[PDB]
Design an enzyme around this catalytic site. Sequence first.
Site, PDB file in Angstrom:
ATOM      1  N   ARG A  91       0.956  -1.091  -0.099  1.00  7.47           N
ATOM      2  CA  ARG A  91      -0.037   0.116   0.123  1.00  7.47           C
ATOM      3  C   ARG A  91       0.894   1.281   0.050  1.00  7.47           C
ATOM      4  O   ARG A  91       0.687   2.035  -0.644  1.00  7.47           O
ATOM      5  CB  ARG A  91      -0.896   0.116   1.363  1.00  7.47           C
ATOM      6  CG  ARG A  91      -2.119  -1.049   1.290  1.00  7.47           C
ATOM      7  CD  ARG A  91      -3.101  -0.989   0.137  1.00  7.47           C
ATOM      8  NE  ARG A  91      -2.462  -1.338  -0.980  1.00  7.47           N
ATOM      9  CZ  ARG A  91      -1.992  -2.489  -1.588  1.00  7.47           C
ATOM     10  NH1 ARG A  91      -2.083  -3.589  -0.518  1.00  7.47           N
ATOM     11  NH2 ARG A  91      -1.559  -2.530  -2.823  1.00  7.47           N
TER      12      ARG A  91
ATOM     13  N   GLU B  68     -13.915 -15.102   8.806  1.00 11.13           N
ATOM     14  CA  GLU B  68     -13.875 -14.520   7.514  1.00 11.13           C
ATOM     15  C   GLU B  68     -13.361 -15.622   6.302  1.00 11.13           C
ATOM     16  O   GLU B  68     -12.067 -15.845   6.377  1.00 11.13           O
ATOM     17  CB  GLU B  68     -12.934 -13.344   7.390  1.00 11.13           C
ATOM     18  CG  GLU B  68     -12.534 -13.087   5.919  1.00 11.13           C
ATOM     19  CD  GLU B  68     -11.478 -11.869   5.732  1.00 11.13           C
ATOM     20  OE1 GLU B  68     -11.106 -11.462   6.751  1.00 11.13           O
ATOM     21  OE2 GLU B  68     -11.666 -11.239   4.700  1.00 11.13           O
TER      22      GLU B  68
ATOM     23  N   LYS C 243     -17.721 -12.391   8.078  1.00 10.36           N
ATOM     24  CA  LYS C 243     -17.222 -11.447   7.226  1.00 10.36           C
ATOM     25  C   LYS C 243     -17.029 -12.356   5.806  1.00 10.36           C
ATOM     26  O   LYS C 243     -15.754 -12.911   5.546  1.00 10.36           O
ATOM     27  CB  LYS C 243     -15.838 -10.792   7.597  1.00 10.36           C
ATOM     28  CG  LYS C 243     -15.150 -10.051   6.508  1.00 10.36           C
ATOM     29  CD  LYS C 243     -14.048  -9.063   7.067  1.00 10.36           C
ATOM     30  CE  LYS C 243     -13.686  -8.164   6.052  1.00 10.36           C
ATOM     31  NZ  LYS C 243     -12.498  -7.347   6.828  1.00 10.36           N
TER      32      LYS C 243
ATOM     33  N   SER D 174     -14.449  -6.008   0.863  1.00 10.34           N
ATOM     34  CA  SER D 174     -14.983  -5.525  -0.434  1.00 10.34           C
ATOM     35  C   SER D 174     -14.132  -6.237  -1.655  1.00 10.34           C
ATOM     36  O   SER D 174     -14.536  -6.009  -2.659  1.00 10.34           O
ATOM     37  CB  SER D 174     -14.521  -3.799  -0.222  1.00 10.34           C
ATOM     38  OG  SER D 174     -13.266  -3.898  -0.168  1.00 10.34           O
ATOM     39  N   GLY D 175     -13.230  -6.878  -0.999  1.00  7.08           N
ATOM     40  CA  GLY D 175     -12.290  -7.507  -2.128  1.00  7.08           C
ATOM     41  C   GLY D 175     -11.565  -6.807  -3.066  1.00  7.08           C
ATOM     42  O   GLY D 175     -10.899  -5.902  -2.671  1.00  7.08           O
ATOM     43  N   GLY D 176     -11.837  -6.733  -4.456  1.00 10.56           N
ATOM     44  CA  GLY D 176     -11.201  -5.658  -5.455  1.00 10.56           C
ATOM     45  C   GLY D 176     -12.149  -4.786  -5.695  1.00 10.56           C
ATOM     46  O   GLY D 176     -11.648  -4.092  -6.794  1.00 10.56           O
TER      47      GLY D 176
ATOM     48  N   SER E 103     -17.190  -4.418   6.431  1.00  9.67           N
ATOM     49  CA  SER E 103     -15.903  -4.273   7.178  1.00  9.67           C
ATOM     50  C   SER E 103     -14.713  -4.199   5.912  1.00  9.67           C
ATOM     51  O   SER E 103     -14.472  -4.956   5.428  1.00  9.67           O
ATOM     52  CB  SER E 103     -15.588  -5.834   7.756  1.00  9.67           C
ATOM     53  OG  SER E 103     -14.688  -5.943   8.440  1.00  9.67           O
TER      54      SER E 103
ATOM     55  N   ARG F 132      -9.667  -1.767   2.027  1.00 10.09           N
ATOM     56  CA  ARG F 132      -9.315  -0.692   0.799  1.00 10.09           C
ATOM     57  C   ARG F 132     -10.471   0.169   0.405  1.00 10.09           C
ATOM     58  O   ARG F 132     -10.372   1.199  -0.055  1.00 10.09           O
ATOM     59  CB  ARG F 132      -8.756  -1.471  -0.598  1.00 10.09           C
ATOM     60  CG  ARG F 132      -7.426  -1.851  -0.328  1.00 10.09           C
ATOM     61  CD  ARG F 132      -7.276  -3.040  -1.207  1.00 10.09           C
ATOM     62  NE  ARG F 132      -5.798  -3.247  -1.415  1.00 10.09           N
ATOM     63  CZ  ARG F 132      -5.250  -4.606  -1.729  1.00 10.09           C
ATOM     64  NH1 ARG F 132      -6.000  -5.645  -1.865  1.00 10.09           N
ATOM     65  NH2 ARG F 132      -3.990  -4.890  -2.219  1.00 10.09           N
TER      66      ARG F 132
END
Lengths: 341, 341
Positions: free
Chosen positions: B39, B184, B226, B268-270, B297, B300
């Site tokens: 990041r 998750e 999640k 949210s993944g990608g 949750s 990004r």
Amino acid sequence: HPALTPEQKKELSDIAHRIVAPGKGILAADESTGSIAKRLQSIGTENTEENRRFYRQLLLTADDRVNPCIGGVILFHETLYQKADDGRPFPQVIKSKGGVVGIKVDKGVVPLAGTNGETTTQGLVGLSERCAQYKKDGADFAKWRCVLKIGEHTPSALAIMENANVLARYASICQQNGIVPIVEPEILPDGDHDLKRCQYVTEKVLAAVYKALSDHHIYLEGTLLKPNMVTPGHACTQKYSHEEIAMATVTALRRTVPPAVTGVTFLSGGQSEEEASINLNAINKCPLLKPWALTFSYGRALQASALKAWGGKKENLKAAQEEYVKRALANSLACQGKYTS
Amino acid sequence: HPALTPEQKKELSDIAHRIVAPGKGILAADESTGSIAKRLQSIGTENTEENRRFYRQLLLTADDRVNPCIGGVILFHETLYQKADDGRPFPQVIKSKGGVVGIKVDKGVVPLAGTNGETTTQGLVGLSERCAQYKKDGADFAKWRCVLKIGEHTPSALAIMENANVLARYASICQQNGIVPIVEPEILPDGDHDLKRCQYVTEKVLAAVYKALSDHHIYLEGTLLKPNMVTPGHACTQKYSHEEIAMATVTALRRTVPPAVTGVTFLSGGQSEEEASINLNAINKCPLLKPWALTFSYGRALQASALKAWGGKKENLKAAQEEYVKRALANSLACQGKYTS
């Protein structure tokens, strides 16, 4: 077998929803000859095909007051092929009153080898053929009963796994033939166990049942669940309120039954007619969030007084129907949380 | 281990409910050094303990506009022990804004021997001790991430069973130490599979997860889930609407997640920041019956713009916080089905 098409799913979901529509429940009149035999001897009545036919006619032809109370009626195969005095097949009688016709398809409980008095249920052999035939002959839903018993070391892991697997296989075959399967994993009230013990076992059993249904790709929206309410053992030394029974029951269900299941139709077990109504009412008044209809699938709880009033005498026909109608109205209100005794 | 007492259950249930209270979601800021490393390089910023501390401070000290949006914040262990410029430990900063402090407790994914590129997650060793320590140091909930991938013959039965078992063991240890576990089981979007394929696999995985939690006697009211939203593969050749994504997601959950689970906090993944908000909003507008909070949750999805605006420059502090605040408000509305882009 092959996955269900949108059309097949719609049919199953529509059937399931009609059975447990608001205010409606199920009349479980699917006693086999051996089972009905004991009911008839209790009223000094000969267990003959005609008396069985007359008794079923008595229940099925009750007056229209039961129409908004009865969403479905479970029959034994003999009755599915019998006719009322006016020549109408019983399935026609049921449908003309707004009910969906159901058919018991299991062939009884048998010992599960190697266990301590535990059982499994037979009937999977030829089930696909029977379902197709029953569908053609008027039935849209079915019922299969498995029995588990609470004891020192029961129900065992083996018994739970075995029974959940059988229920899943039965459910798959039903849906492949356009029939909504009602899964009935009854945990007997027998024993001196307390309320929490029953709740724990019920949670364990239902979790196994739904994992099994998942493994067999069962369309839950096209199914119904017929479980025991969570109550203290029949020989329990502690007393519990209807509120405690309702809370234990709703909690067990919330912890195990996916929201996709269309409805829960409780069996009454050994509860009296009024007890079964009071508890169902309490279950529906529980403030907790319940994503499925919570209604009844009662046999004795709807028939006890009617059977007694009939006494095998034709002149007692209307009196017997009145007893049944009274319980139908009571439970119709109970599944809406509006029954007041 | 020993069953939970009423007091222990109340603590867990209260914590779980506060995190996903109406309008609230979770800020997932629990990137390890290796994860946060990527990041930071994306914004040409040195990955040092101080820059990591400054960045976390930037997010945690955003203005009170985020208070009603953020019910919980997940931290990496390093951050749990860092302090803001004013000397306040980060857990204190989070709690003073009404948030619950969370801690990631898994130690990363590793190869699952014998499988075709499949994985499992390590970290169970010493987990009980870490949970007790984190609880003492301010954390009330935790997170453990397992990863499954859709392919020709994956996820396999072995991978699903292995990962569900690990999540259950982790969840049990958390609850024994007064920590609410967030389970998750992420199913990666990687691949050219369609929406229904993702839905099917998600249903299979969640069913395995909850059976495993049942086997380990996990108190569901004291847990959160999640999961990935159900979407088409990243390389899918077919386009799907937000409505189709919402329907597939809610349906998968209704078919597998017991009503007792307190809340679902989507990863949210990608997905882009706005895509994640739009889909969460659509999920909440779905008319279907949903017995658990459906919220966020996001990592990004809440940080992308903030990280970019900061650029590792102290003078960009407020601008960066504003980007984060905007996404917090957006998702707060989305988890109420009230977000309008």
